[PDB]
Structure formats: C-alpha cells, structure tokens
Symmetry: C2
Subunit: 99 residues, 2 copies
C-alpha cells in the first residue's frame, strides 16, 4: 500500500515460515534480521566491526513476503537493533519513494 512517514515504517513480514516486524529502510543496502530461526542452509559472512568480525550469517533461498508480495531473497542474520528491509528486498517488491 501507501505509507506516510509520521510513524516509523514498520511492516509485518513473513520470512521463511515466521512473522516478524521489520522496518522499511531506504537508507539500508541489505535486509538484516536478528532474533531469528530460519530453517535454511546458511553461510558465514565476513563483516568488519569494532573489536573485530561481527557474527553474521547469510541465508539465500529465503521466502519473504510483505503485503501479499511473495519473493525469494537474501537475509543477513546479525546484530541490528530492529529487523531492517533494505533496498535489496524493496526493489524485488517494486517499492517507490514518492513526493
């Protein structure tokens, strides 16, 4: 649908099998979740951080659905204050910014 920005743009997402709230974040390149149980095959990911490598897993072949749109994407699992839907998943979903 169509979202104004008075509230943070949290949306309900079905990721893998599970329902989570995630923020649509046009400033973020990737889609990251924390606190999650993906059944997928994951691979480790190298992400440089303060004090060394952050603990970050990558899941491909992830069913993602937001507002009826069902897609297969890539989800990073790592430390993040909220779940974020970055531009990688927004573009697969035809999301535009309007003004």
């Amino acid at each position: 649908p169509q979202i104004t920005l008075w509230k943070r743009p949290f949306v309900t997402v079905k990721v893998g099998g599970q329902l989570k709230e995630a923020l649509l974040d046009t400033g973020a390149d990737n889609t990251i979740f924390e606190d999650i149980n993906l059944p997928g095959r994951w691979k480790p990911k190298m992400v440089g951080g303060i004090g060394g490598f952050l603990k970050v897993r990558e899941y491909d072949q992830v069913p993602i659905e937001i507002a009826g749109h069902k897609v297969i994407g890539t989800v990073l699992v790592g430390p993040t204050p909220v779940n974020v839907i970055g531009r990688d998943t927004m573009t697969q979903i035809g999301a535009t910014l309007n003004f």
Copy 2:
C-alpha cells in the same frame, strides 16, 4: 518526483541557504548533515548504532528546502557517512513509501 530504489535515493537539498546532496532515509528519525556552518546556539545530542555512539549538535530555526517546499526546524550536525534526510524532514514534504 517518483524514485525507485535500484540506486541510493539521493536528492539535492538547500539547507541553511546552502545546496547539498542527501540520502532520503526512511529508517532515520532525524535529518543530519556534516560539514556545514549554521547560525545560532546548538544543543548536545547523541546518535548511535555501532561505529559507536556519536555526540552530535542540534541547531534550531534551520531552513530546509526540497523542491520548492520549505520547513524551518531542527537539524543535526555531526559525523555521518552521507548527508541524511530523515523522517522529520520527509513528512514536511509529503513523502510516501509505495509498495
């Protein structure tokens, strides 16, 4: 304008009478610029994540123009990877997220 997310959603802005480029960032509550000189008193604020917690400055009565729209409010000044137009400013121009 109607702006897709294949690239980083940068636009031209006039902040405190000066032209800049900034990323339209739906995941940021506030607008922040680096490397600008504003008139008047500031207040200490902090923005975080990791990279750490960053002490920043908040200025008031600051004019922002995005496509002939105009708002006079607060902005943050401090270290930031790119200039950022946050929700606080994007609501003042009518911006929406459409999926």
